[PDB]
PDB file of C-alpha atoms and ligand atoms in Angstrom:
ATOM      1  CA  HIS A   1     -14.309 -29.659  -3.723  1.00 34.47           C
ATOM      2  CA  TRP A   2     -13.103 -26.432  -5.254  1.00 35.91           C
ATOM      3  CA  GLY A   3      -9.557 -25.335  -4.645  1.00 34.83           C
ATOM      4  CA  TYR A   4      -6.494 -23.970  -6.407  1.00 35.99           C
ATOM      5  CA  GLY A   5      -5.082 -27.124  -7.956  1.00 40.06           C
ATOM      6  CA  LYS A   6      -4.968 -28.068 -11.677  1.00 43.00           C
ATOM      7  CA  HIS A   7      -8.007 -30.274 -11.123  1.00 42.50           C
ATOM      8  CA  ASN A   8     -10.196 -27.940  -9.091  1.00 40.70           C
ATOM      9  CA  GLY A   9      -8.788 -24.478  -9.658  1.00 39.16           C
ATOM     10  CA  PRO A  10     -10.220 -21.204 -10.976  1.00 40.17           C
ATOM     11  CA  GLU A  11     -10.752 -22.575 -14.467  1.00 41.47           C
ATOM     12  CA  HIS A  12     -13.070 -25.242 -13.092  1.00 41.73           C
ATOM     13  CA  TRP A  13     -15.172 -23.163 -10.719  1.00 42.68           C
ATOM     14  CA  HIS A  14     -17.821 -22.177 -13.223  1.00 43.11           C
ATOM     15  CA  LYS A  15     -19.141 -25.733 -13.321  1.00 41.42           C
ATOM     16  CA  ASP A  16     -20.435 -25.619  -9.774  1.00 42.28           C
ATOM     17  CA  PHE A  17     -20.653 -21.839  -9.635  1.00 41.22           C
ATOM     18  CA  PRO A  18     -21.914 -20.512 -13.009  1.00 41.97           C
ATOM     19  CA  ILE A  19     -21.708 -16.969 -11.684  1.00 39.79           C
ATOM     20  CA  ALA A  20     -17.966 -17.381 -12.239  1.00 38.90           C
ATOM     21  CA  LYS A  21     -18.649 -16.086 -15.753  1.00 34.38           C
ATOM     22  CA  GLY A  22     -20.918 -13.298 -14.626  1.00 31.43           C
ATOM     23  CA  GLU A  23     -21.079  -9.596 -15.283  1.00 31.19           C
ATOM     24  CA  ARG A  24     -19.281  -8.267 -12.155  1.00 30.66           C
ATOM     25  CA  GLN A  25     -16.616 -10.822 -11.239  1.00 31.30           C
ATOM     26  CA  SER A  26     -13.414 -10.107  -9.331  1.00 32.55           C
ATOM     27  CA  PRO A  27     -10.523  -9.604  -9.246  1.00 31.29           C
ATOM     28  CA  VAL A  28      -9.746  -7.404 -12.231  1.00 31.85           C
ATOM     29  CA  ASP A  29      -6.756  -5.678 -13.696  1.00 32.25           C
ATOM     30  CA  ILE A  30      -6.720  -1.984 -12.751  1.00 33.22           C
ATOM     31  CA  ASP A  31      -5.670   0.053 -15.776  1.00 35.50           C
ATOM     32  CA  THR A  32      -4.320   3.180 -14.142  1.00 31.28           C
ATOM     33  CA  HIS A  33      -4.581   5.290 -17.215  1.00 25.87           C
ATOM     34  CA  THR A  34      -8.210   4.269 -17.862  1.00 25.50           C
ATOM     35  CA  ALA A  35      -9.437   4.686 -14.270  1.00 25.74           C
ATOM     36  CA  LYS A  36     -11.152   8.031 -13.995  1.00 26.09           C
ATOM     37  CA  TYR A  37     -10.722  10.370 -11.106  1.00 25.27           C
ATOM     38  CA  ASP A  38     -14.085  10.943  -9.420  1.00 25.03           C
ATOM     39  CA  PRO A  39     -14.059  14.283  -7.582  1.00 27.77           C
ATOM     40  CA  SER A  40     -17.298  13.322  -5.855  1.00 28.24           C
ATOM     41  CA  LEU A  41     -15.729  10.343  -4.062  1.00 25.39           C
ATOM     42  CA  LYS A  42     -15.344  11.096  -0.339  1.00 26.70           C
ATOM     43  CA  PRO A  43     -12.355  10.218   1.760  1.00 26.97           C
ATOM     44  CA  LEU A  44     -12.490   6.712   3.105  1.00 26.91           C
ATOM     45  CA  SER A  45     -13.273   6.439   6.843  1.00 26.24           C
ATOM     46  CA  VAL A  46     -11.536   3.455   8.478  1.00 28.25           C
ATOM     47  CA  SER A  47     -12.416   3.333  12.138  1.00 32.44           C
ATOM     48  CA  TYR A  48     -10.575   0.410  13.698  1.00 31.41           C
ATOM     49  CA  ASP A  49      -9.734   1.780  17.140  1.00 32.66           C
ATOM     50  CA  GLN A  50     -12.340  -0.386  18.835  1.00 31.88           C
ATOM     51  CA  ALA A  51     -11.721  -3.558  16.811  1.00 31.20           C
ATOM     52  CA  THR A  52     -12.198  -6.854  18.676  1.00 28.95           C
ATOM     53  CA  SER A  53     -10.248  -9.653  17.045  1.00 31.84           C
ATOM     54  CA  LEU A  54     -11.057 -13.104  18.266  1.00 33.20           C
ATOM     55  CA  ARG A  55      -9.531 -16.029  16.405  1.00 32.03           C
ATOM     56  CA  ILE A  56      -7.382 -17.087  13.462  1.00 29.70           C
ATOM     57  CA  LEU A  57      -8.491 -20.060  11.360  1.00 28.03           C
ATOM     58  CA  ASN A  58      -6.931 -22.073   8.588  1.00 28.14           C
ATOM     59  CA  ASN A  59      -9.960 -22.881   6.428  1.00 28.23           C
ATOM     60  CA  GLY A  60      -8.132 -24.930   3.794  1.00 25.12           C
ATOM     61  CA  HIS A  61      -8.008 -22.085   1.270  1.00 26.82           C
ATOM     62  CA  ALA A  62      -6.336 -19.296   3.324  1.00 27.36           C
ATOM     63  CA  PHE A  63      -6.355 -18.190   6.973  1.00 27.09           C
ATOM     64  CA  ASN A  64      -8.948 -15.817   8.413  1.00 29.29           C
ATOM     65  CA  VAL A  65      -8.470 -13.484  11.370  1.00 29.10           C
ATOM     66  CA  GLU A  66     -11.990 -13.171  12.721  1.00 28.87           C
ATOM     67  CA  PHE A  67     -13.574 -10.156  14.575  1.00 25.81           C
ATOM     68  CA  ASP A  68     -16.620  -9.623  16.827  1.00 27.95           C
ATOM     69  CA  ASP A  69     -19.124  -8.096  14.396  1.00 28.00           C
ATOM     70  CA  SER A  70     -22.104  -8.149  16.748  1.00 26.76           C
ATOM     71  CA  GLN A  71     -21.707  -4.429  17.374  1.00 24.20           C
ATOM     72  CA  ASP A  72     -20.425  -1.390  15.534  1.00 22.59           C
ATOM     73  CA  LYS A  73     -16.770  -1.571  16.533  1.00 23.57           C
ATOM     74  CA  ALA A  74     -14.393  -1.754  13.598  1.00 21.64           C
ATOM     75  CA  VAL A  75     -16.128  -0.109  10.656  1.00 21.90           C
ATOM     76  CA  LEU A  76     -15.664   1.219   7.193  1.00 25.04           C
ATOM     77  CA  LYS A  77     -17.653   4.163   5.867  1.00 24.57           C
ATOM     78  CA  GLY A  78     -17.306   6.996   3.375  1.00 23.45           C
ATOM     79  CA  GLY A  79     -15.525   6.688   0.084  1.00 21.49           C
ATOM     80  CA  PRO A  80     -18.018   5.197  -2.431  1.00 22.85           C
ATOM     81  CA  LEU A  81     -20.099   3.734   0.351  1.00 21.40           C
ATOM     82  CA  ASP A  82     -23.514   4.597   1.756  1.00 24.99           C
ATOM     83  CA  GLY A  83     -23.986   3.393   5.261  1.00 24.32           C
ATOM     84  CA  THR A  84     -21.838   1.519   7.726  1.00 23.53           C
ATOM     85  CA  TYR A  85     -19.909  -1.682   7.024  1.00 23.06           C
ATOM     86  CA  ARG A  86     -18.637  -3.805   9.951  1.00 21.51           C
ATOM     87  CA  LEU A  87     -15.322  -5.670   9.769  1.00 21.98           C
ATOM     88  CA  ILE A  88     -15.929  -9.411  10.054  1.00 22.30           C
ATOM     89  CA  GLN A  89     -12.598 -10.896   9.005  1.00 20.76           C
ATOM     90  CA  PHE A  90      -9.455 -10.421   6.984  1.00 18.09           C
ATOM     91  CA  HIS A  91      -7.367 -12.888   4.958  1.00 17.61           C
ATOM     92  CA  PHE A  92      -4.690 -12.845   2.343  1.00 18.94           C
ATOM     93  CA  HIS A  93      -3.946 -14.393  -1.074  1.00 19.35           C
ATOM     94  CA  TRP A  94      -0.342 -15.089  -1.895  1.00 20.89           C
ATOM     95  CA  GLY A  95       2.002 -16.831  -4.307  1.00 19.92           C
ATOM     96  CA  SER A  96       4.669 -19.470  -4.373  1.00 21.01           C
ATOM     97  CA  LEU A  97       7.108 -16.811  -5.704  1.00 20.87           C
ATOM     98  CA  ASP A  98       7.447 -13.102  -4.916  1.00 21.50           C
ATOM     99  CA  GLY A  99       6.483 -12.209  -8.515  1.00 21.89           C
ATOM    100  CA  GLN A 100       2.885 -13.438  -8.135  1.00 21.77           C
ATOM    101  CA  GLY A 101       0.176 -13.745  -5.470  1.00 24.59           C
ATOM    102  CA  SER A 102      -2.109 -10.737  -5.713  1.00 25.34           C
ATOM    103  CA  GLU A 103      -5.556 -11.072  -7.220  1.00 28.23           C
ATOM    104  CA  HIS A 104      -6.023  -7.578  -8.481  1.00 26.89           C
ATOM    105  CA  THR A 105      -3.235  -6.340 -10.716  1.00 28.18           C
ATOM    106  CA  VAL A 106      -2.143  -2.737 -11.533  1.00 30.07           C
ATOM    107  CA  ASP A 107      -1.323  -2.237 -15.210  1.00 29.87           C
ATOM    108  CA  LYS A 108      -0.856  -6.075 -15.288  1.00 29.32           C
ATOM    109  CA  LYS A 109       1.587  -5.956 -12.395  1.00 27.38           C
ATOM    110  CA  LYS A 110       1.217  -8.736  -9.827  1.00 27.41           C
ATOM    111  CA  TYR A 111       2.182  -8.141  -6.205  1.00 27.27           C
ATOM    112  CA  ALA A 112       3.483 -10.844  -3.837  1.00 27.76           C
ATOM    113  CA  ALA A 113       0.175 -10.977  -1.944  1.00 29.14           C
ATOM    114  CA  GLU A 114      -3.075  -9.108  -1.302  1.00 28.69           C
ATOM    115  CA  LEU A 115      -4.871  -8.466   1.943  1.00 31.07           C
ATOM    116  CA  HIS A 116      -8.673  -8.493   1.974  1.00 29.94           C
ATOM    117  CA  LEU A 117     -10.420  -6.775   4.945  1.00 30.35           C
ATOM    118  CA  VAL A 118     -14.030  -7.929   4.596  1.00 31.98           C
ATOM    119  CA  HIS A 119     -16.902  -5.738   5.831  1.00 31.99           C
ATOM    120  CA  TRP A 120     -20.694  -6.125   5.639  1.00 30.06           C
ATOM    121  CA  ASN A 121     -23.463  -3.511   5.362  1.00 28.59           C
ATOM    122  CA  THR A 122     -25.219  -3.239   8.718  1.00 29.94           C
ATOM    123  CA  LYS A 123     -28.559  -2.514   7.084  1.00 31.39           C
ATOM    124  CA  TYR A 124     -28.706  -6.212   6.185  1.00 33.53           C
ATOM    125  CA  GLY A 125     -28.405  -7.520   9.766  1.00 32.69           C
ATOM    126  CA  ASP A 126     -25.919 -10.283   9.254  1.00 33.84           C
ATOM    127  CA  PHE A 127     -23.205 -11.436   6.840  1.00 32.04           C
ATOM    128  CA  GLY A 128     -25.320 -14.209   5.366  1.00 30.06           C
ATOM    129  CA  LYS A 129     -28.000 -11.809   4.284  1.00 31.26           C
ATOM    130  CA  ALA A 130     -25.549  -9.172   3.182  1.00 30.82           C
ATOM    131  CA  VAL A 131     -23.875 -11.472   0.603  1.00 31.47           C
ATOM    132  CA  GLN A 132     -27.220 -11.790  -1.180  1.00 30.12           C
ATOM    133  CA  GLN A 133     -27.249  -8.024  -1.855  1.00 29.03           C
ATOM    134  CA  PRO A 134     -25.468  -6.024  -4.575  1.00 26.37           C
ATOM    135  CA  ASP A 135     -24.224  -3.538  -1.936  1.00 27.92           C
ATOM    136  CA  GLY A 136     -23.899  -6.110   0.865  1.00 26.63           C
ATOM    137  CA  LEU A 137     -20.100  -6.085   1.325  1.00 26.66           C
ATOM    138  CA  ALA A 138     -17.200  -3.684   1.091  1.00 27.20           C
ATOM    139  CA  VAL A 139     -13.770  -5.311   0.823  1.00 24.59           C
ATOM    140  CA  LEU A 140     -10.715  -3.136   1.411  1.00 27.52           C
ATOM    141  CA  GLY A 141      -7.868  -4.660  -0.678  1.00 26.36           C
ATOM    142  CA  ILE A 142      -4.225  -3.864   0.085  1.00 26.48           C
ATOM    143  CA  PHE A 143      -1.282  -5.038  -1.903  1.00 28.70           C
ATOM    144  CA  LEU A 144       1.847  -6.551  -0.357  1.00 31.98           C
ATOM    145  CA  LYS A 145       5.321  -6.105  -1.906  1.00 30.03           C
ATOM    146  CA  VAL A 146       8.473  -7.771  -0.586  1.00 29.39           C
ATOM    147  CA  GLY A 147      10.986  -5.386   1.028  1.00 29.87           C
ATOM    148  CA  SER A 148      11.122  -4.228   4.624  1.00 31.19           C
ATOM    149  CA  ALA A 149       9.174  -6.022   7.304  1.00 31.60           C
ATOM    150  CA  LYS A 150       5.680  -4.877   8.284  1.00 32.63           C
ATOM    151  CA  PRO A 151       5.767  -4.771  12.149  1.00 32.97           C
ATOM    152  CA  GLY A 152       2.016  -4.951  12.422  1.00 32.61           C
ATOM    153  CA  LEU A 153       1.986  -8.215  10.531  1.00 29.59           C
ATOM    154  CA  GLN A 154       4.451 -10.061  12.757  1.00 27.46           C
ATOM    155  CA  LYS A 155       1.898 -11.197  15.331  1.00 27.21           C
ATOM    156  CA  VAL A 156       0.082 -12.988  12.463  1.00 27.84           C
ATOM    157  CA  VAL A 157       3.236 -14.570  11.096  1.00 28.54           C
ATOM    158  CA  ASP A 158       4.298 -15.816  14.549  1.00 23.28           C
ATOM    159  CA  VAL A 159       1.015 -17.775  15.125  1.00 22.05           C
ATOM    160  CA  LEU A 160       0.866 -19.606  11.800  1.00 22.05           C
ATOM    161  CA  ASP A 161       2.761 -22.627  13.003  1.00 19.83           C
ATOM    162  CA  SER A 162      -0.189 -23.277  15.358  1.00 17.07           C
ATOM    163  CA  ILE A 163      -2.732 -23.408  12.488  1.00 17.01           C
ATOM    164  CA  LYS A 164      -0.639 -25.195   9.960  1.00 18.05           C
ATOM    165  CA  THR A 165      -3.425 -27.409   8.578  1.00 18.82           C
ATOM    166  CA  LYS A 166      -6.985 -27.146   7.469  1.00 19.56           C
ATOM    167  CA  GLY A 167      -9.478 -26.896  10.345  1.00 18.36           C
ATOM    168  CA  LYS A 168      -7.006 -25.608  12.900  1.00 18.32           C
ATOM    169  CA  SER A 169      -7.723 -22.465  14.807  1.00 17.69           C
ATOM    170  CA  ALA A 170      -6.141 -20.419  17.631  1.00 15.02           C
ATOM    171  CA  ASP A 171      -6.987 -17.562  19.863  1.00 16.34           C
ATOM    172  CA  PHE A 172      -6.083 -14.275  18.210  1.00 11.48           C
ATOM    173  CA  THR A 173      -7.431 -11.643  20.555  1.00  9.89           C
ATOM    174  CA  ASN A 174      -6.077  -8.107  20.972  1.00 11.51           C
ATOM    175  CA  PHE A 175      -4.777  -7.765  17.410  1.00 10.37           C
ATOM    176  CA  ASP A 176      -4.862  -4.223  15.955  1.00 10.18           C
ATOM    177  CA  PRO A 177      -5.606  -4.252  12.213  1.00 10.69           C
ATOM    178  CA  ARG A 178      -4.586  -0.633  11.949  1.00 12.84           C
ATOM    179  CA  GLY A 179      -1.023  -1.988  11.797  1.00 16.83           C
ATOM    180  CA  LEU A 180      -1.715  -3.492   8.361  1.00 17.35           C
ATOM    181  CA  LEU A 181      -2.581  -0.273   6.637  1.00 14.78           C
ATOM    182  CA  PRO A 182      -0.335   1.871   4.412  1.00 14.35           C
ATOM    183  CA  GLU A 183       0.042   5.628   5.091  1.00 16.43           C
ATOM    184  CA  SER A 184      -2.166   6.746   2.246  1.00 14.56           C
ATOM    185  CA  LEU A 185      -5.830   5.847   1.815  1.00 16.52           C
ATOM    186  CA  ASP A 186      -5.963   6.802  -1.865  1.00 21.23           C
ATOM    187  CA  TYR A 187      -7.929   4.113  -3.682  1.00 19.40           C
ATOM    188  CA  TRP A 188      -9.645   2.714  -6.751  1.00 19.57           C
ATOM    189  CA  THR A 189     -13.152   1.397  -6.547  1.00 18.80           C
ATOM    190  CA  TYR A 190     -15.466  -0.747  -8.639  1.00 20.49           C
ATOM    191  CA  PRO A 191     -18.430  -3.155  -8.227  1.00 18.66           C
ATOM    192  CA  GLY A 192     -17.370  -6.764  -8.009  1.00 19.20           C
ATOM    193  CA  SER A 193     -17.622 -10.118  -6.258  1.00 18.98           C
ATOM    194  CA  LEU A 194     -16.158 -12.495  -3.714  1.00 16.51           C
ATOM    195  CA  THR A 195     -13.040 -13.981  -5.231  1.00 13.10           C
ATOM    196  CA  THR A 196     -13.609 -17.573  -4.163  1.00 15.89           C
ATOM    197  CA  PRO A 197     -16.825 -19.606  -4.479  1.00 16.45           C
ATOM    198  CA  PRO A 198     -19.640 -18.834  -4.066  1.00 14.39           C
ATOM    199  CA  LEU A 199     -18.294 -15.823  -6.092  1.00 15.28           C
ATOM    200  CA  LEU A 200     -21.313 -13.739  -5.110  1.00 15.56           C
ATOM    201  CA  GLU A 201     -21.603 -10.356  -6.777  1.00 15.42           C
ATOM    202  CA  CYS A 202     -22.129  -8.428  -3.563  1.00 15.78           C
ATOM    203  CA  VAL A 203     -18.905  -6.501  -3.195  1.00 19.13           C
ATOM    204  CA  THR A 204     -18.000  -2.860  -3.479  1.00 21.81           C
ATOM    205  CA  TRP A 205     -14.256  -3.109  -3.970  1.00 20.11           C
ATOM    206  CA  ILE A 206     -11.947  -0.467  -2.540  1.00 18.77           C
ATOM    207  CA  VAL A 207      -8.321  -1.154  -3.521  1.00 17.90           C
ATOM    208  CA  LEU A 208      -5.654   1.028  -1.927  1.00 17.78           C
ATOM    209  CA  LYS A 209      -3.077   2.493  -4.333  1.00 18.59           C
ATOM    210  CA  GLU A 210      -0.201   2.273  -1.807  1.00 18.70           C
ATOM    211  CA  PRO A 211       1.062  -1.200  -1.167  1.00 14.28           C
ATOM    212  CA  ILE A 212       2.429  -2.214   2.210  1.00 14.47           C
ATOM    213  CA  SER A 213       5.906  -3.718   2.445  1.00  8.45           C
ATOM    214  CA  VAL A 214       6.474  -7.053   4.114  1.00  7.83           C
ATOM    215  CA  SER A 215       9.773  -8.976   4.474  1.00  7.37           C
ATOM    216  CA  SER A 216      10.790 -12.021   2.520  1.00 10.47           C
ATOM    217  CA  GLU A 217      10.798 -13.981   5.826  1.00  8.61           C
ATOM    218  CA  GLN A 218       7.228 -12.912   6.568  1.00 11.94           C
ATOM    219  CA  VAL A 219       5.782 -14.112   3.232  1.00 11.54           C
ATOM    220  CA  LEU A 220       7.994 -17.215   3.345  1.00  8.16           C
ATOM    221  CA  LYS A 221       6.132 -18.230   6.485  1.00  6.62           C
ATOM    222  CA  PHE A 222       2.758 -17.773   4.753  1.00  6.31           C
ATOM    223  CA  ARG A 223       4.007 -20.365   2.270  1.00  4.82           C
ATOM    224  CA  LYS A 224       4.683 -22.996   4.982  1.00  3.58           C
ATOM    225  CA  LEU A 225       0.956 -23.321   5.705  1.00  3.46           C
ATOM    226  CA  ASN A 226      -0.934 -26.354   4.369  1.00  2.96           C
ATOM    227  CA  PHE A 227      -4.113 -26.675   2.239  1.00  2.79           C
ATOM    228  CA  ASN A 228      -4.455 -30.231   3.641  1.00  2.00           C
ATOM    229  CA  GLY A 229      -5.662 -31.363   7.060  1.00  2.00           C
ATOM    230  CA  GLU A 230      -3.494 -32.932   9.669  1.00  2.00           C
ATOM    231  CA  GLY A 231      -2.476 -36.500   8.816  1.00  2.00           C
ATOM    232  CA  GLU A 232      -2.829 -35.981   5.088  1.00  3.85           C
ATOM    233  CA  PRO A 233      -0.162 -35.585   2.343  1.00  3.94           C
ATOM    234  CA  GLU A 234       1.351 -32.140   2.618  1.00  4.04           C
ATOM    235  CA  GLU A 235       0.172 -29.600  -0.007  1.00  2.00           C
ATOM    236  CA  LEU A 236       1.743 -26.214   0.626  1.00  2.13           C
ATOM    237  CA  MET A 237      -0.746 -23.355   0.830  1.00  3.17           C
ATOM    238  CA  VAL A 238       0.606 -21.198  -2.003  1.00  5.41           C
ATOM    239  CA  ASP A 239      -0.905 -19.553  -5.102  1.00  5.75           C
ATOM    240  CA  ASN A 240      -4.361 -19.312  -3.539  1.00  6.43           C
ATOM    241  CA  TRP A 241      -5.286 -16.462  -5.829  1.00  4.83           C
ATOM    242  CA  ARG A 242      -7.807 -16.120  -8.638  1.00  2.00           C
ATOM    243  CA  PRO A 243      -6.484 -14.399 -11.778  1.00  2.65           C
ATOM    244  CA  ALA A 244      -7.951 -11.212 -13.230  1.00  3.71           C
ATOM    245  CA  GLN A 245     -11.434 -11.513 -14.744  1.00  5.98           C
ATOM    246  CA  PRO A 246     -13.048  -9.557 -17.692  1.00  3.84           C
ATOM    247  CA  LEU A 247     -14.032  -5.989 -16.632  1.00  6.86           C
ATOM    248  CA  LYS A 248     -17.022  -6.155 -18.909  1.00  6.03           C
ATOM    249  CA  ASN A 249     -19.444  -3.230 -18.406  1.00  5.20           C
ATOM    250  CA  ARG A 250     -17.747  -1.631 -15.431  1.00  3.09           C
ATOM    251  CA  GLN A 251     -15.745   1.492 -14.751  1.00  2.82           C
ATOM    252  CA  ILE A 252     -13.024   1.700 -12.167  1.00  9.08           C
ATOM    253  CA  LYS A 253     -12.967   5.041 -10.362  1.00  7.08           C
ATOM    254  CA  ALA A 254      -9.974   6.736  -8.670  1.00  4.19           C
ATOM    255  CA  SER A 255     -10.214   8.783  -5.487  1.00  5.68           C
ATOM    256  CA  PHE A 256      -7.093  10.655  -6.423  1.00  3.74           C
ATOM    257  CA  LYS A 257      -5.457  12.944  -8.981  1.00  3.50           C
TER     258      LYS A 257
HETATM  259  S1  LIG B   1     -12.542 -11.294  -0.634  1.00  5.53           S
HETATM  260  C1  LIG B   1     -13.573 -12.422   0.075  1.00  5.53           C
HETATM  261  N1  LIG B   1     -14.183 -12.326   1.228  1.00  5.53           N
HETATM  262  C2  LIG B   1     -14.970 -13.518   1.350  1.00  5.53           C
HETATM  263  C3  LIG B   1     -15.782 -13.963   2.341  1.00  5.53           C
HETATM  264  C4  LIG B   1     -16.357 -15.206   2.203  1.00  5.53           C
HETATM  265  C5  LIG B   1     -16.075 -15.976   1.039  1.00  5.53           C
HETATM  266  C6  LIG B   1     -15.255 -15.595   0.035  1.00  5.53           C
HETATM  267  C7  LIG B   1     -14.680 -14.323   0.272  1.00  5.53           C
HETATM  268  O1  LIG B   1     -13.825 -13.607  -0.579  1.00  5.53           O
HETATM  269 ZN1  LIG B   2     -10.111 -12.607  -0.635  1.00  8.38          ZN
END
């Protein structure tokens, strides 16, 4: 019954998911002056040329664009990672206003939205097993700021009216996720967790420094989605982000400068 309302939002999650107050929870604020450059960090390897998207689903919390992860197709490697991580889905977190929406923050700055490209470590066989491991997932986080339109995001925006409510899905084949990436792959990285229940501490976070720009019309359409199912009172799907959590005993490393 968890969600993003006053009654079941982030401040309530710890009751059903005690790990919400754990030692490596996400998101976090990225203090740019405190993040240390790690010359040993390798360039990130994002290989999405063979990606096979399949479907887009409104799950009542956000919408997921799902991929075929039964083979090494779209994969993330390098950077802070050991091994190969397969892309399984991507989703976003956004706000009701352009001044809020991202989960991670940069020197306390909030972006209008944040894209999460979720990948799982192939050494664990499947996603369900991977989330039970400290190095099971690698999530590539990309900030969205409002300005010029992002062409590669338009196919997603255009299909949203067909998955307006919780439980609705639609075919979403032949979508190229490379169109959602910024020019630079410079990043910050730290050990964290899923940002919605079950809040499992299985994620190596890789957050890109360069945000992508999307238009006001594009994000406006995200805000027309519904948290509710069809035939239920309309609750706009906005502010589906968890605020920054205590960094605790962790160091955020930078791949640049
Ligand atoms: S980020 C991110 N990826 C996730 C996958 C499953 C459940 C929660 C999640 O949060
Ligand atoms: Zn997420």
